[PDB]
Structure formats: C-alpha cells, structure tokens
Amino acid sequence: GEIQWMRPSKEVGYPIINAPSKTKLEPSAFHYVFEGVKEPAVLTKNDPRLKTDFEEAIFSKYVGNKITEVDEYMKEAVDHYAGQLMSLDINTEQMCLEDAMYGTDGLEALDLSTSAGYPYVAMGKKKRDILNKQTRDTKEMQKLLDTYGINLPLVTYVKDELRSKTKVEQGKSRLIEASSLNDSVAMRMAFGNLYAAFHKNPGVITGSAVGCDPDLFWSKIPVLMEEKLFAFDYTGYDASLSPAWFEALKMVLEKIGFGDRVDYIDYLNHSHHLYKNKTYCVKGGMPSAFSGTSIFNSMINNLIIRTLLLKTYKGIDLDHLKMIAYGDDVIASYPHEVDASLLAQSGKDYGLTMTPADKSATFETVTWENVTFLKRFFRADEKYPFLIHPVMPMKEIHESIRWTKDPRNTQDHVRSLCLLAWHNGEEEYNKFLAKIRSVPIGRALDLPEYSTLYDRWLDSF
Ligand code: NA
C-alpha cells in the first residue's frame, strides 16, 4: 500500500468530514480492581500524550508496494486455491438488494450502528433513516444507488480503542476506512453468496475462519490441521498489500465464476479516501471497513502462504497444506516441518513483513501447546479430551474490563468477557467473578457461574 497523493478535499470537490475527537472510553467501575496498562488511542494530533507527529504515524502503515505483477508462484497459488474453492459449489449468482441489505442464510443484515460513509455522513443522513429491518424495504436504498452511484470515497475515522502506552506515544492509532453504504451494498450484491458460502464453511477448504464460533470450532480445527504446525505474525498486513495481490485475488474470483465483477476489487486496490479536510489516493492496501474486508484478506492470505511455500520449497504439495486464516491471523500446517524464518525471508520480496508467532523474538517451533488463533490457545477439556477449549489469556480480559464505552452496556460487556474467561478454568473464573463482585456495579450484574457455563458448553455441541 502506498499513498499516491494527499491534499485538501475542497481542491478535488469534497466537503470537510467531521470526525469525533474525544474518546468514549472512560475508566469503568473495575478500573482499580484489575491490572491493566492500556489506554484509549490518540484520536487527534493535539493529544498531550503524543511524542511524534500524529498524521505521519497513522499513515506510516503504507510501507509501499514491493511487487508490480503476478509472478509464476502466485499464479500457481491462484490455481491451487481456486481449484480448492471449486469443490464448494459456491453459488455465483448476484445477491438481490433485499438480502444484501437485510441478510439471508449465512449473511447477517447490514450493521445499523456503523457509519453510512460518504456522502451520507456529510448530509447528516443515518442508516436508520434508510433501512427498515421490519419492512425490509429496498425502495429508499435503490433511490440512493441511482442518485449517488458507486465507487465513492472511503471515509476515514481513527478507531476508538485501547492501545499500549508505546502505541499511544507513537501515535500508532488504527484507522477505520468506511466504504459508503452504496458500495457496501453493491459489493454484498456482487459477492453476497461468496460471503455466505465462506461463513457457512469455516475450515481448510475455504482456508477461512470468518463467521466461526470459537466455542465449537476449536474442537474441529485440530482434526483439520496436519502433523506439523507453522505460523507467523504480519506487521501491518492490510496496508502492506501490493496491487499484484489484488490482481491475484481477481484471478481466483474469475476462476470460480465471479469474473463477472472483479472490477469491484479495483475499487479496493486503487482507492479514494476522505480524512478530516483532506482527500488522498492509495495504490494497494486493503480498506479496513467495507463489506468483505475479512474475507478478502483471508483469501489473499491463502494465496500468500501458498506462494511463499512454492517459492521457498519447490515440489511442496499444496494439497497437504492445511491452513485457516482470519484476515492476517492464521494457523497453518504441513506433513513436514517448514522454516517460518525462511518463509518470512521470501515474504519480504512480496511486500510482506513476517515476524515470529505471538511476538516471539526468534522463530520457534509451533506446537499445539503454544499455538494461538484469534489470541486463543487450544486446550483439551480435562473431562472430555475430544472437546477443545479456546483459551484467551486473562490479561486481555482484564485490560478490557477496566474501561467502558457506555454504562448501559456494562452488563453485556462483562457477560461477553465472562464467555471468554471461564475457559481458563474454574479457579481462575471464580477469582474473576469475586473481584467483579468486590464493587457495587459488579454485584448488581447477572453473571453465569462456572458450572452453568460448562454445562451450556457441553450442550452446545
Ligand atoms: Na487500497
């Protein structure tokens, strides 16, 4: 990803976009009951905590484009992945406006709380004013599609979330690149069935985990993985993607019956963005908030890993590459041991910056004991080994519970954390509940006890 140019929006015919400047994150009733070191991300260039230029920091993720065209290894990767996806008999017909808007089997309705993007955000028009969940009315949307068309600028907002102290000082805030509601709708109409097929088929065939339920999926993953696991982290994955990776994605789409609308991919690759009073053009880089971000990043990850394996290990048997991606996150395997360090080396030539799994300083062997996926470890249940626990460390949960974005959601927020935490065991879960109940807010919540969650879990399979 690389920014071609950036300049005042008015110079290119666009209005200034108002973006919040104050975090909605504030210390929760549990702020001093649990340990934590994260704080709300910087949202404005004048944040006191900043120790470097803000604008430069948030856009530094665009490290450039290392590759121009699709080489032979990538083409091979494309053929293998596409051939694999072919076995799913994915429905290639366009999805009707109604379902694209309000959902159908395998595709949730459009999120009504998130930005409607340009130009709606500039006309003070919300999604709630356009969509009718009980009516499933498409008239207003259709009228808007005809009026403002598609391929509209993506509206950039700084993401309001917790970040390490280092990332706050270095202005390393993440960005939300919201595609207009029109584009989102058009893309779900174009690829709606592809998305549904992926959501209904998490595993090693789609090579994707999007739409998965960790509580149930964790027990299925091992049986899908090979003998030897391998994994690694990406530094700024989305933004590092070069145009060639988007072209490779289109080839996959053409081969599986969607050649009909690969043009939509161009809109993602060569994209137009609005931020505050500036507009900028990016070549490469996956936009962070459009309908399909996760899925397309996952598909591209499948192409990347196959490519690096072909480039590094000629003769590799991709039919025995078993991987599951979720955007940039990935858990992979092969019958034979592979060197992630070598793969990482091959990765640089493709514009990818790969580092040791889970922030290790060195590339170590990945085992079922130390591997993580979506920040969750895998642990066989003590009583029924065949049931696998997705174990998210308490550290993350403690960090999260120390802040709130709305006192009215305290109950939901804390229940959510409980669904993640109990997997750490009864002793730990009870210590968590007790601390929660050491303050009034926590004592007034209705939280499930350990045995309740365990029973609920066994009854969910
Ligand atoms: Na882009």
Swiss-Prot record:
Cofactor dependence: Mg(2+)
Summary of subunit composition and partner proteins: Interacts with Viral protein genome-linked and with protein 3CD.
Binding site for Mg(2+) 1: D233, D328
Cofactor note: Binds 2 magnesium ions that constitute a dinuclear catalytic metal center. The magnesium ions are not prebound but only present for catalysis. Requires the presence of 3CDpro or 3CPro.
Ranges facing Cytoplasmic side: 1-461
Compartments (UniProt record): Host cytoplasmic vesicle membrane
Amino-acid positions noted as binding Mg(2+) 2 in the UniProt annotation, renumbered to this chain: D233, D328
RdRp catalytic domain ranges (all copies): 227-342
Protein name per the record: RNA-directed RNA polymerase
Record membrane topology: Peripheral membrane protein
Regulation: Replication or transcription is subject to high level of random mutations by the nucleotide analog ribavirin.
Top-rank taxon: Viruses
Function: Replicates the viral genomic RNA on the surface of intracellular membranes. May form linear arrays of subunits that propagate along a strong head-to-tail interaction called interface-I. Covalently attaches UMP to a tyrosine of VPg, which is used to prime RNA synthesis. The positive stranded RNA genome is first replicated at virus induced membranous vesicles, creating a dsRNA genomic replication form. This dsRNA is then used as template to synthesize positive stranded RNA genomes. ss(+)RNA genomes are either translated, replicated or encapsidated.
Reactions performed catalytically: RNA(n) + a ribonucleoside 5'-triphosphate = RNA(n+1) + diphosphate
